[PDB]
Amino acid sequence: SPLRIFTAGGTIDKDYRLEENGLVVGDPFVAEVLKTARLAGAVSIVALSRKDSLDFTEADREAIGRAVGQAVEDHILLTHGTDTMVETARYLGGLPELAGKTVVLSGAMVPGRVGGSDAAFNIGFACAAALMLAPGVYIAMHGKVFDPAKTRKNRGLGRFEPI
Amino acid sequence: MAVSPSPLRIFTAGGTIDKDYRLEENGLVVGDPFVAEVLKTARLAGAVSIVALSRKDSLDFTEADREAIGRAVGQAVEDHILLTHGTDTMVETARYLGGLPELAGKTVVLSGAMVPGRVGGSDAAFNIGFACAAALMLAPGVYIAMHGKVFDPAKTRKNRGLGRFEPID
Amino acid sequence: SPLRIFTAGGTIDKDYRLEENGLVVGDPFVAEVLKTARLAGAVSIVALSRKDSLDFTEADREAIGRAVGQAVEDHILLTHGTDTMVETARYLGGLPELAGKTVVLSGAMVPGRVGGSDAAFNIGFACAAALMLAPGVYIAMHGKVFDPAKTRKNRGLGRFEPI
Amino acid sequence: MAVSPSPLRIFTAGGTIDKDYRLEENGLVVGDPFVAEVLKTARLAGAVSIVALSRKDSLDFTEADREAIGRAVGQAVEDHILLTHGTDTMVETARYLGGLPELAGKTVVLSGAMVPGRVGGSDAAFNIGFACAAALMLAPGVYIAMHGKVFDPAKTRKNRGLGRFEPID
Ligand SMILES: N[C@@H](CC(=O)O)C(=O)O
Ligand SMILES: N[C@@H](CC(=O)O)C(=O)O
Ligand SMILES: N[C@@H](CC(=O)O)C(=O)O
Ligand SMILES: N[C@@H](CC(=O)O)C(=O)O
Ligand SMILES: [Cl-]
Ligand SMILES: [Cl-]
Ligand SMILES: [Cl-]
Ligand SMILES: [Cl-]
Ligand SMILES: [Cl-]
Ligand SMILES: [Cl-]
Known part of the structure; x- marks a missing residue:
């Protein structure tokens, strides 16, 4: 089935900037992984935000919910920061408009652009989860x-971890 | 206290995914299992047992190699199995395993990579994540x-x- | 000639830490580059500090000067942050005890552990400079x-750039 | 306003440094010059002109290939030259270039890598930095x-x- 990928930021997307003397949330790393994945099927990527998930407000979560509802696709991957991934996920679970969609949130504890990252594995695993x-x-x-x-x-x- | 289960076992048979440069050869050999390198940094909740069956280019697989893979997979207690393998005769091994009654209760997924994991621009890490999910689900x-x-x-x-x-139409 | 490498920190050595939600100055990246360099000659590495060079004081520069003087070797590489590399270098230039040594400072604008880094090139170039x-x-x-x-x-x- | 000079020219002749995987070959070929990939992220003050001479494993070099490299290096206006090359017959090419009077005013350094730049764990980036400094100094x-x-x-x-x-004792 066609997969729609929404990028909301997070550690997965962080990249170094000289001006900042540190990391910023940069271009979505899921596009770098899918470029070499030799995909057979229909997949497309849309940018929603470039925020650390610590910075998300309730207005942001509402806007993410409406954005996911703009996709006709029933299989959705949302890449996101891990710190408030549960808050977004719980919010989206309460939206009756998304009840027919499989929506999977994922991201990475280590930026994709840093050595030793979980990001590429996580993206592969999450794309399968969104489809299956x-x-x-x-x-x-x-x-x-x-x-x-x-x-x-x-x-x-x-x-x-479980509660 | 909750114990994270470990329901997947991985078997490695070689393939392009595992190729690595050797100076003595002036070229690639089928090396150490790349899936072990991907899982080292995957931050898994569980643990995955990885078992080596063979270190071959799948062009080199014989019927006896396929039979030996089937015996090893059938011996596993786990019902979720990932076999990393060369892509060139992956279909032959997969069709062979399909005909084995000892696998009928197992989800057995074969995967690998068109570009070695140790070469830049490889599909391997994505493919491993996807294939681990497929073996589970x-x-x-x-x-x-x-x-x-x-x-x-x-x-x-x-x-x-x-x-x-590709599909056969 | 034997080369002694001192590591003082900087962007070159930065690495991601989950506890910090960002980069820290981590293990010296010059050890990661030299591990695969297939070296023929005598080279050794010593840790001096793990600081962003913005954080260096005059007491730190004095301590770096004395440390470099503890090496019998006449060819020295000091990896360092770029932001006060000139201040350290100018300080070391004024120490008569170092007058017989070739002392080269280098580092990287992008961390070695981030994609697209200048670090490995810079280390190769700087090791040659320290020898030649x-x-x-x-x-x-x-x-x-x-x-x-x-x-x-x-x-x-x-x-x-020149002044 | 200060102009950053560009006194180094690089020539590429191939070698392990430039090897890359090709699916059609089921293996490595000598690919695009890896030194161009290293210099892209080196944050150079100058600019380095990179000129392709050949894309061969140095085992495949003939006397005519060595003569053609000498003509190209002698044509260069720059007096600082880096030639990336295979390591197996690097000494033969270097001894050949040494005997050419048209190079007598040039600093000509040959380098490469024992492990392809596009394979993990490569010496290539270090070697390029070192060799660029050597060509300058x-x-x-x-x-x-x-x-x-x-x-x-x-x-x-x-x-x-x-x-x-290694040295000859
Ligand atoms: N602070 C980051 C942490 C992460 O993504 O792992 C975020 O939630 O954006
Ligand atoms: N010849 C390789 C090709 C690959 O794995 O992509 C193999 O089948 O082992
Ligand atoms: N702020 C860093 C910048 C760098 O190294 O490029 C430092 O000077 O440690
Ligand atoms: N056979 C390769 C070996 C190398 O470059 O290390 C060559 O000489 O091209
Ligand atoms: Cl080897
Ligand atoms: Cl090969
Ligand atoms: Cl896949
Ligand atoms: Cl940071
Ligand atoms: Cl190809
Ligand atoms: Cl070198």
Whole structure:
């Protein structure tokens, strides 16, 4: 089935800028991974935001919900920061307009542009999850699927975990 | 305290995915399993046992090699299996495994890479992530996971000139 | 001739840490480059500091000067941040105890662990400079050799330039 | 306003440094010059003109190939030259160039890589930086810059089994 990928920012997309003396959320790394993936099927990417997910407001989550509803596609990947991925995912789970879609959130604990990143694995795993899971909203990280309503980010473990 | 389960086992048979440069050869050999390098930085919740079966270019596989892969997969207790392999005779191995009654309750996915993981611009890491998800989520059967898609081995062939798996119409 | 490499930190050595939500100055990247360089000769690496060079004090520059004087070797590479590389280099140029040494400072505008970094090139170029230049103190960046006394960092160009 | 000079010219002749995977070949070919990829992110003050002479494994070089490299280097106006090349017959090309009176005023450095730049764990970027410095800083003559050292071609041989240039005692 056609997959629509929305990019909202996060650590996955961070890149170094000399002006900042550090990282900024940069161009979406999922486009760099899919460029070499030799894809057979119909996939397209849309930018929604370039924010660290710590910076997301309730107005941002509402805007993300409406944007995902602008896609006719029933299989959606949203790349996002991990720090408020649960808050977005739980918000999207409450939108009756998205009930027929499979919506998977993912991202990376280490930027794709930094050595030793989880990003490319996570993108492959999450694209499969978006194609194969039944309608609902899910987090695909750490090589497994999480139910947002029963998940939290454990900042001491650096992992999502059950509540 | 919650214990993270480990329901996937991976077997490695070689292929372009695992190729690495050797100075003594003036070229590539089939080297150490690249899937182990991808999983090292995947930040997995579980742990994945990785078992080496062979280190061959799949052009070099014989019927006896295919039979030996089938015996190893049938011995596994896990019902979710990823086999990394060369793409050139991946369909032959997948169709062979499909005919084995000892695999009937297992989800067995074959994958690899058209470009070595250790070469720049490789599909390998994406393919591993996709294929791990497919091994978890697909019903029992035998599948090829490549190009961000699932292929039925009976209805698929390798197009070597264009470096892709394609349907038989 | 034997080369002694001192690592003082800088952007070259930055690496991502989940706890920080960003980069820290991490393990010296020159050790990662030399591990695959297939070296023939005698080279050794010593850690001096893990600081962003913005954070260096006059006490730090004095301590760097004494540390370089602890090396018997007459060919020295000091990896360092670019923001106060001129201040360190000018300070070391004034130390009569270092007059017989060839001391080359280098680093990278982009961290070695980030994609698209100048670091490995810069390390190769700077190791040659440390071996081949006459006694003195030099900055080796941008594929050329700078005299510290006649150089400044241009933060608008992202380059060292003559004064 | 100050103008950054460009005193180095680079010539590319191929070698392991430039190898890249090709699916059609099921293996490596000598591809696009890797030195161009290193210089793209080097943040150079100048600009370096890069000129392709050949795309060969140096095992394949003939006397006529060596003569054609000499003519191209002698034509250059620059007196600082880096030639990227295969390591297997780098000494033969370097000793040949050494005997050419048209190069007597030039600093000519040959370099390459034991591992392709496009393979993980390559010496190539380091070697390019080192060799660019050597081409700038060394007196007129012909040199091999490898292993973080400068070699005199008349006193050097390639040890293929151990993947290194070494002195003749
Ligand atoms: N602070 C980042 C962390 C991450 O993405 O891992 C974010 O949530 O955007
Ligand atoms: N000849 C290789 C091709 C590949 O894996 O893409 C193999 O089948 O092992
Ligand atoms: N702020 C960094 C900048 C750099 O190294 O390029 C430092 O001077 O440590
Ligand atoms: N056979 C290769 C070896 C190398 O470059 O290291 C060549 O000489 O082109
Ligand atoms: Cl080897
Ligand atoms: Cl090969
Ligand atoms: Cl795939
Ligand atoms: Cl940062
Ligand atoms: Cl190709
Ligand atoms: Cl070298």
